[PDB]
Design a protein around this ligand. Structure first.
Ligand SMILES: CC(C)(C)OC(=O)N[C@@H]1CNC[C@H](C(=O)N(Cc2cccc(Cl)c2Cl)C2CC2)C1
Ligand SMILES: *[C@@H]1O[C@H](CO)[C@@H](O)[C@H](O)[C@H]1NC(C)=O
Length: 335
């Protein structure tokens, strides 16, 4: 253990995407990336991506021919995401993340489907998960940063702000920033190592524990935009809110959004409550317009799922600390 705590400033895009900058190669090629606790691989779009993938034409591409620090690998890599899929191959190069430089193995993506990557403001993803979830058993960037013995502590923490021209968010590698949280952290120990998943002991709509009464799983996913549950759990939840299912989202009439009940998540000791201002995209107060909720269905497949996922919707209210040393997640009220 060292005495270094570095931070990555994040950009908040529409309260759904939070991305910072990383630099790959010599000289550095910069990419906008999402720091994802629900995955463990690093990947950026490749120059080897065909121009027929319209997503590739609209994102920064890594070119190994312009990097003197590049080391070829070539092993195939397929990443099947709950939202889509990416294929490419592995490569090793020097990666800079908040003043920390690490030699890192990552995927050069050559197949990037338009839907959903034409909606991505970010170029790629920096997986903040454990080696146990890394496709091709590639050493994750945080495990490589830990190995340097440069960090003050074996933790990293997230701050995600409400959309505004202010700070979008922040990741602190090696600690937590007290300027973005109040009170003290309440920890919840991980069920098992290998996943950033904890036990949840009930989801309540208002006063009545409407779901997860006999306990259920909660994945603390910085890479997920919304709060997610199973199709059955979300169907029951939305019926309790009066929410009408559209194709991809759930909506309410804009005028009845501020009246919607509080939603609570029973984790560790505490009840983590979100008011309707925390989960409704309150775009108007019109009885003639529809307002989307920041909760959606996601049937995650085993071993990880079925599970709930506490994404950006949760992290905006609760500043989150991911402790690798003690295999726990700490929450504090964000500020
Ligand atoms: C099986 C395994 C590979 C581990 O599963 C996962 O990695 N599962 C991922 C877990 N974390 C959320 C990930 C995600 O959905 N996106 C996509 C995304 C989010 C918001 C907006 C857009 Cl446009 C997109 Cl594309 C990645 C950027 C983080 C899926
Ligand atoms: C790619 O990386 C892995 C990392 O463990 C290494 O063992 C393997 O030999 C590499 N493959 C090639 C083709 O260089």
């Amino acid at each position: 253990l060292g005495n270094t705590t570095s931070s990555v400033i994040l950009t908040n895009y529409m309260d759904t995407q939070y991305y910072g900058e990383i630099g790959i190669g010599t000289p550095p090629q910069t990419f906008k990336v999402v720091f994802d606790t629900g995955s463990s691989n690093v990947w950026v779009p490749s120059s080897k991506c065909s121009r027929l993938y319209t997503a590739c034409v609209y994102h920064k591409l890594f070119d190994a021919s312009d990097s003197s620090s590049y080391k070829h690998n070539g092993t195939e890599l397929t990443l099947r995401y709950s939202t889509g899929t990416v294929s490419g191959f592995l490569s090793q190069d020097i990666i800079t993340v908040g003043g920390i430089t690490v030699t890192q193995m990552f995927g050069e993506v050559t197949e990037m489907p338009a839907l959903p990557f034409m909606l991505a403001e970010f170029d790629g993803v920096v997986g903040m998960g454990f080696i146990e979830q890394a496709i091709g058993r590639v050493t994750p960037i945080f495990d490589n940063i830990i190995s340097q013995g440069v960090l003050k502590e074996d933790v990293f923490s997230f701050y995600y702000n409400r959309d505004s021209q202010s700070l979008g968010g922040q990741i602190v590698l090696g600690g937590s920033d007290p300027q973005h949280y109040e009170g003290n952290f309440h920890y919840i120990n991980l069920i098992k190592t290998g996943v950033w998943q904890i036990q949840m002991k009930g989801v309540s709509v208002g006063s009545s524990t409407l779901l997860c009464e006999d306990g259920c799983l909660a994945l603390v996913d910085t890479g997920a935009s919304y709060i997610s549950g199973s199709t059955s759990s979300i169907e029951k939840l939305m019926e309790a809110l009066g929410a009408k299912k559209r194709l991809f989202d759930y909506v309410v009439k804009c005028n009845e959004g501020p009246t919607l009940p509080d939603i609570s998540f029973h984790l560790g000791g505490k009840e983590y409550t979100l008011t309707s201002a925390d989960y409704v995209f309150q775009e108007s107060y019109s009885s003639k317009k529809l307002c989307t909720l920041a909760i959606h269905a996601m049937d995650i497949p085993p071993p990880t799922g079925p599970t709930w996922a506490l994404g950006a919707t949760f992290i905006r209210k609760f500043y989150t600390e991911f402790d690798r040393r003690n295999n726990r997640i700490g929450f504090a009220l964000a500020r």
